[PDB]
């Protein structure tokens with residue numbers, strides 16, 4: 001039907017430049033505007049600008065004019081946004097949306113994540129979280145980049161698991177996961193979290209031991 | 212430039228009508244501001260809902276309508292469905308910029324409210340060995356999904372060193388969030404009581420531990 005396909009995840013260093021792109025499907029590219037939206041972690045949404053491929057009219061947010069170049073190739077039905085002189089404040093999910101008269105985005109692309117960081121690939125330090133039903137946890141601390149996958153007892157413990165979203169602390173991520181099991185069950189039944197960090201082929205298992 | 216203001220959170224039950232408003236710091240919203248409403252559902256799923264003050268976007272249910280009520284733009288959902296639980300943003304075309312409001316979290320009560328299960332974990336030995344100490348507070352199974360988390364070290368409010376995640380939807384449609392207090396092992400040793408206080412629907416839950 002209408003589809004707005006976006007490019008994937010970008011990892012960039014401070015000072016660099018990136019080019020992100022959006023392909024149209026299901027409509028006449030030339031008759032509509034392509035707008036770009038920035039969504040910060042929690043800083044709401046900000047409109048970056050818009051381009052009309054039919055005549056390449058562009059509109060820009062004043063705040064972003066100095067570092068953004070918006071373009072479109074009609075032959076390829078693709079719009080591009082180039083961002084320059086990146087700083088960690090440009091880390092956000094960017095969306096391209098389809099617009100027209102009186103509106104900027106009836107159909108939305110899926111979002112392309114950009115992280116700007118000078119950090120290096122760092123493996124997680126995994127720590128067991130014992131109390132001393134009972135809730136056990138694993139702290140997965142200090143890894144870069146995303147993601148890590150956490151399982152409990154090699155996937156056999158799937159009920160009662162909560163894995164929380166990562167926070168950035170200093171310039172590395174920290175994440176935790178918990179599992180709740182019947183009291184009787186622990187310690188007789190061994191509970192282990194298994195943490196994989198693909199970028200550094202880190203795989204580590206941590207058995208939870210009562211304190 | 213101009214500031215666009217929306218309610219921060221509204222709650223309704225299935226089948227009721229609820230109205231969300233969007234206003235500008237220049238006084239009135241007009242037709243020339245082309246008020247837009249979009250919906251944000253989990254995992255960055257956005258849907259256009261209303262464009263140009265009152266046009267439903269393609270395939271939006273007729274229970275969604277946009278109007279200007281007085282000097283404000285407003286979105287009304289007549290007969291709210293459990294699936295309308297989402298964040299709603301309005302934006303206004305002003306000075307050739309689309310300017311966004313901060314969004315309204317709408318809870319549409321499709322199940323009973325549930326209080327948070329809070330769990331506070333102490334630092335592990337292995338981490339204290341690195342000269343760091345991180346306390347972990349997990350908050351799960353709360354519904355509505357809006358909570359505030361406060362940390363106290365020997366009764367004093369903590370203002371630096373804690374991190375809290377935004378509430379994520381559990382698969383059972385309740386919500387979960389975690390908070391971290393990070394200190395050096397040195398500092399952790401100068402204090403005895405540690406508290407994670409979570410307020411949800413005007414009630415506080417406190418989990419406290421003592422270094423010792």
Ligand SMILES: C[C@@H]1O[C@@H](O)[C@H](O)[C@H](O)[C@H]1O[C@H]1O[C@H](CO)[C@@H](O)[C@H](O[C@H]2O[C@H](C)[C@H](O)C[C@H]2O)[C@@H]1O[C@H]1O[C@H](CO)[C@H](O)[C@H](O)[C@H]1O
Nearest residue numbers: 033050052055057059099100101102103104245304307309
């Ligand atoms: C598509 C059109 O192409 C040329 O004619 C010229 O470059 C125009 O600037 C350009 O777009 C303006 O005109 C059309 C008229 O139908 C509007 O639909 C456009 O507005 C839509 O897209 C922008 C980016 C916003 O999302 C708001 C949408 O309505 C756009 O309008 C803007 O420019 C004209 C200039 O004549 C006028 O000032 C409008 O008030 C302004 O919104």
